[PDB]
Design a protein around this nucleic acid. Structure first.
Lengths: 160, 186, 289, 213, 52, 122
RNA sequence: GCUUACGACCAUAUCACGUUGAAUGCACGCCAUCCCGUCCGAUCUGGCAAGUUAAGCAACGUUGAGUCCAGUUAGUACUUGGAUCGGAGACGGCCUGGGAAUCCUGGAUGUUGUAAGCU
RNA sequence: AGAGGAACCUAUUCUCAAACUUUCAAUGGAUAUGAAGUUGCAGUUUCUUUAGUGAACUGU
RNA sequence: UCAGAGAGGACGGAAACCUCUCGUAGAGCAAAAGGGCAAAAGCUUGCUUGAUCUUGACUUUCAGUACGAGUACAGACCGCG
């Protein structure tokens, strides 16, 4: 059986990227984190304090606490037939804002703005629903300067 | 054509006053090879010569052949700058009769020699002290080396501004009326 | 000898951050100087940059953002001619005056100068801006850069100037001039004399007595401006009074038209044409040699 | 004696190179991999014949040496030691293991069975795939027949199926003969002993002038 | 008679038989494990807001 | 694009294609059952369609067929109103049922030949 | 078109050699009474302005090395799912969908923020 | 394994790695996709800020 | 600023000690292996006892028990700057 140390099998997971070692740039510390925000977890090997467990690497969580240089995150973890919302205290260096929620918030803003504009201007309420890409419509293709090229299977050649 | 103007411009640039070669420092070394009274008396010799207290260098390893143990003080050295350096350099070159080999000059423009008896440097022999030999090293370089040594925003000295063996030899010959002996038979 | 800087060396080489290659920013200290606690969110944390060049003293107030620092106020010792002083724009007195200028200027800008006058009587004693009313004094943390923190250094002279101007700069009197490191005693009189430039006047008198030629060489432009060793202190006091009287930034000028003084990058066609010309020239030289 | 090759024929385990973890490995039987006129200039031998494999198996060092000896002997006897260059394009790097068991009566008294059955090094084998080149020979255009017959005789020392073919490439270079001739005429290919080096355009023109291309 | 025999064979089927239950939605409402100073200030803020 | 991936996932187990007018009408008239309060009720009358899809202006089997064929705005409701068709085995048999249609088998996308198959199944 | 202070991204910014550099500035620079630190005023520190763009730095140059981007490699290698598919087997192709990376070829050689100033 | 300047330097070359890697799939994992939401107005805080400055909370 | 290389210097040699250039870490960090680190996490040096007092929360193993180990805070008294 395997040993059960904290950093077993993280040889590449906790390593830095090629030609990306050294001093950690400061935007990491300038980023703003508020409780209720969604963050991706990606361990930074250069910082050994407040490191997330390997199980949480690459997962997204919701912030529930904001301390001086760390955040508490609620991350879903599957244990047998239940998903547990584990709470973990991770430092800022291992955290990154999640764009999935921000995209949705932008879409909500656009929807509200479009609805307000249409109602104010008396236009009919617009369609504010994402729809799956439908099958292509009917069209005409012209062969002018694009004559069809007759293709045939090629014979076998002995490429030594 | 254009080459004439280029060459005259390059020579005019080389005649710049900031390119003047000067003595940066003179390093005096005495590796006594052991600790104790001999090292103390060598330190006294260097103090008498330079006028400033020297510093002791300890062995980096242990060599049974040399009788050296790690962290044992075995050398004393001084660094001299300014007119004092020129005075001591002239005394040493007098001891050598202003004769040097072309193989005494390094690729970076520094040159050194050695004195076997410090009495020859115009130091009165003292029975309590004794006689010691020492290594003389002279570092020549122009103004503007501070850019490579300052703490803030250090740079790299340009190739034209760097010194060469030929320029060092010419400086020696002109300044000290030096003589370049034929190569020591290899 | 094996070439160390070969293709593999360059292929595996990783460059440092630009401001580290330039040898201008110490990122270890920068992280601790500019990073705000995450439970304070976007509240700016203000830093007092002090930088002394060969001919000028620069004092700035800034706070960091994810796209670059924001400088909110700045005072340069080359502005002191507006307040008297024309020479000696780098000594202890000039540094202190620059700090005072920055403090008063920014306090006026944010409309706190009336509330916080600062220490208006130069005594050299350690001073901290005590809170008045409800608004606490403006706060900034000192940033010395790559300078050495020695006793009596001019970076702490600028810090002292700001503190006396009335900005809360967390500090202790250990590194001010006149602080004896051995007995841990602070000489406010010595610090005041240094702030007023008495050391410069003493050097002037000493050189005048020693050798007139050396004196002229050392203080050529001081004499040209008419500052001898018996009015320098009064000049510095007048400078302090003028700064405390008016501190608003100087008015900007009009954008003069600009022309190209450097060479413009060659175009792709020009580069190819030069390559062709060089090929032809090299071939001709080969044939004619 | 050695176990029959059929016991280690097919590729079953992961590569097991000799390293700091696999120590006490006996030496491989085959040592020489270039035979004949190996110092000939690139233009000396323009024709090339390969012996490709049609099996995904292990070629033992013993088999490799046996085939080398056979092909070398035939080629030397029928063309002279300076009429060909033979290169073995397969080196035995995989270590096979053996779990030795006593084979005498009463052996079960001491026999451990399968308990702790991890083996010890036995020999070196070359892992081969379909289409892999085993042997290569560069010779003059009037010796292709001898080369083909030599490889035909050698193929009988390897397990499984091998296919002998001729290559359109010039000798051991990677350029088909027509383009090789054209580029060498243009001066874009500089001799590099057995092979050649392509001289790309880019670079300082001071270097370009030494060979305008 | 070896009897270690670990395996994970029939475990996903057992886990999924009664479905994989996702966490509830009120779990984000609790203020448990939050900074004590922040909690103290929140108590003070809530204890003083005038109702009308 | 939201349904085609499912049709690729379930390829080996389904035969699907593009129904035509006669196929849709035959399916609806001969094997149309509605899901009414969770019960499978044969559609023998147009009122049965009207009671559940009248709110969408679908009152007759022809309206239902049009909605399905032209993929109207209420395709989801129209189709979910229909119980999954329970077809008969084709008269003539299958071909392979273990190979794609293009391999000479049965499963996968038969395009417009689903009508040929359904003419025997319905 | 630039200079400086503080930066953000952290080589399209690095590295080598060379040309040019208006004005501000930066820099080198002179001195060592004082503060301060050294075997050594070399570094660090302090007081200055005779001199210099020589070097640093900036722009530019190079069929430049590196880095970055793209093309090709190639619908190739590999791969999800299917077969009472071929083959003694190793393996191989077909159906259904995903789909690379070297070599090689071409191009680019920092972008930008706040504050102050030159032009 | 040769080549260009016995070893050495330079540019190459044949064959490789479960405990080698610049690069890097397919299958795979995770999160989000509104009423428990979005905009304001109008109050609380002993937390935070130089500061209604923020953070959070409250309101029939 | 390391490992190392190059070039120089009385006795000094392949190796003692001094000097200059280059040097992406090829060194070192108590120990196994793997990560991490360059105005540092390495080396030299000053001062020190946060290796202290108190309770909760959480991670790891996990049954989401306990020990051990660790993480982020809160309250006190301190150290360095």
């Amino acid at each position: 059986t395997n040993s059960k140390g904290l950093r077993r099998g993280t040889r590449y997971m906790f390593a830095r990227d090629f030609r990306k070692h050294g001093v950690e740039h400061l935007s990491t510390y300038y980023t703003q984190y508020k409780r209720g925000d969604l963050v991706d977890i990606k361990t930074n090997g250069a910082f050994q304090k407040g490191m997330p467990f390997k199980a949480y690497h690459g997962r997204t969580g919701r912030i529930f606490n904001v301390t001086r240089g760390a955040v508490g995150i609620i991350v879903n973890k599957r244990v047998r037939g239940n998903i547990l919302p584990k709470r973990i205290n991770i430092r800022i260096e291992h955290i990154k804002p999640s764009k999935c929620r921000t995209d949705f918030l932008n879409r909500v803003k656009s929807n509200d703005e479009k609805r307000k504009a249409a109602k104010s201007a008396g236009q009919p309420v617009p369609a504010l629903k994402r729809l799956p890409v439908a099958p292509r419509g009917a069209h005409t293709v012209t062969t002018q300067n694009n004559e069809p090229e007759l293709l045939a299977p090629l014979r076998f050649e002995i490429v030594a | 054509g254009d080459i004439e103007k280029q060459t005259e411009i390059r020579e005019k640039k080389a005649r710049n006053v900031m390119r003047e070669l000067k003595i940066q420092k003179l390093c005096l070394n005495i590796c006594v090879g052991e600790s104790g009274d001999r090292l103390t008396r060598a330190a006294k010799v260097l103090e008498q010569l330079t006028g400033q207290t020297p510093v002791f260098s300890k062995a980096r390893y242990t060599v049974r052949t040399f009788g050296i143990r790690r962290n044992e003080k075995i050398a004393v050295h001084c660094t001299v700058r300014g007119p004092k350096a020129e005075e001591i350099l002239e005394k040493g070159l007098k001891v050598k009769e202003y004769e040097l080999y072309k193989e005494n000059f390094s690729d970076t423009g520094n040159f050194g020699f050695g004195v076997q008896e410090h009495i020859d440097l115009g130091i009165k022999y003292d029975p309590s002290i004794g006689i010691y030999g020492m290594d003389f090293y002279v570092v020549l370089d122009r103004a503007g080396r501070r850019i490579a040594k300052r703490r803030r925003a250090p740079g790299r000295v340009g190739p034209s501004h760097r010194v060469e063996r030929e320029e060092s030899i010419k400086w020696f010959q002109q300044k000290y009326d030096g003589i370049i002996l034929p190569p020591k038979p290899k | 000898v094996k070439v160390i800087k070969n293709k593999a060396y360059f292929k595996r080489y990783q460059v440092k951050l630009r401001r580290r290659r330039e040898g201008k920013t110490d990122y270890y200290a920068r992280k601790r100087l500019t990073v705000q606690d995450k439970n304070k969110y976007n509240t700016p944390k203000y830093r007092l940059i002090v930088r002394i060049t060969n001919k000028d003293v620069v004092a700035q107030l800034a706070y960091s953002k994810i796209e670059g620092d924001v400088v909110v106020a700045s005072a340069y010792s080359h502005e002191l001619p507006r307040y008297g002083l024309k020479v000696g724009l780098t000594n202890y007195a000039a540094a202190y005056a620059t700090g005072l200028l920055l403090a008063r200027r920014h306090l006026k800008t944010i409309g706190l100068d009336s509330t916080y006058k600062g220490h208006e009587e130069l005594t050299g004693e350690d001073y901290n801006v005590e809170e008045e009313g409800d608004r606490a004094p403006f706060k900034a943390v000192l940033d010395i850069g790559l300078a050495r923190t020695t006793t009596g250094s001019k970076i702490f002279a600028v810090m002292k100037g700001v503190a006396d101007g009335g900005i809360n700069v967390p500090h202790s009197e250990s590194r001010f001039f006149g602080f004896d490191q051995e007995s841990k005693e602070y000489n406010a009189e010595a610090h005041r004399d240094r702030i007023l430039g008495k050391h410069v006047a003493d050097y002037m008198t000493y050189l005048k007595e020693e050798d007139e030629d050396r004196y002229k060489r050392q203080f050529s432009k001081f004499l040209a401006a008419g500052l001898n060793a018996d009015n320098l202190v009064a000049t510095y006091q007048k400078v302090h009074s003028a700064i405390r009287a008016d501190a608003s930034p100087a008015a900007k000028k009009a954008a003069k038209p600009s022309k190209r003084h450097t060479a413009k990058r060659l175009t792709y066609d020009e580069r190819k044409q030069r390559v062709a010309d060089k090929k032809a020239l090299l071939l001709q030289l080969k044939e004619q040699q | 004696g050695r176990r029959p090759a059929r016991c280690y024929r097919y590729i079953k385990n992961k590569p097991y190179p000799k390293s700091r973890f696999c120590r006490g490995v006996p030496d491989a039987k085959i040592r020489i991999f270039d035979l004949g006129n190996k110092r000939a200039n690139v233009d000396t031998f323009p024709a090339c014949v390969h012996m490709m494999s049609n099996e995904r198996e292990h070629l033992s060092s013993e088999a490799l040496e046996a085939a080398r000896i056979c092909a070398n002997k035939y080629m030397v006897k029928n063309c002279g030691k300076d009429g060909f260059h033979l290169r073995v394009r397969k080196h035995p790097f995989h270590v096979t293991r053996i779990n030795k068991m006593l084979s005498c009566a009463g052996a079960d008294r001491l026999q451990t069975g399968m308990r702790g059955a991890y083996g010890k090094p036995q020999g070196l084998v070359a892992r081969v795939d379909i289409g892999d080149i085993l042997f290569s020979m560069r010779i003059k255009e009037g010796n292709v027949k001898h080369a083909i017959e030599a490889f035909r005789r050698a193929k009988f020392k390897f397990p499984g199926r091998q296919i002998i073919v001729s290559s359109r490439k010039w000798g051991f270079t990677k350029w088909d003969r027509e383009d090789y001739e054209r580029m060498r005429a243009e001066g874009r290919l500089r001799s590099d002993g057995v092979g050649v080096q392509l001289q790309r355009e880019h670079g300082p023109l001071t270097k370009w002038i030494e060979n305008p291309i | 008679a070896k009897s270690k025999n670990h395996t994970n064979h029939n475990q996903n089927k057992k886990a999924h038989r009664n479905g994989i239950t996702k966490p509830k939605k009120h779990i984000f409402l609790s203020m448990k494990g939050v900074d004590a100073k922040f909690i103290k200030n929140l108590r003070f803020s809530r204890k003083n807001n005038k109702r009308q | 694009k939201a349904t085609l991936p499912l049709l690729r996932i379930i390829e080996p187990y389904v035969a699907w294609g593009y129904p035509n007018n006669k196929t849709i009408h035959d399916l609806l008239y001969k094997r149309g059952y509605a899901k009414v309060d969770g019960n499978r009720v044969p559609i023998t009358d147009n009122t049965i369609v009207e009671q559940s899809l009248g709110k969408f202006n679908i009152i007759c089997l022809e309206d239902l067929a049009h909605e399905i064929a032209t993929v109207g705005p209420h395709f989801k409701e129209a189709t979910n109103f229909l119980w999954p068709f329970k077809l008969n085995n084709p008269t003539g048999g299958w071909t392979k049922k273990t190979n794609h249609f293009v391999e000479g088998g049965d499963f996968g996308n038969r395009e417009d030949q689903i009508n040929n198959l359904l003419r025997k199944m319905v």
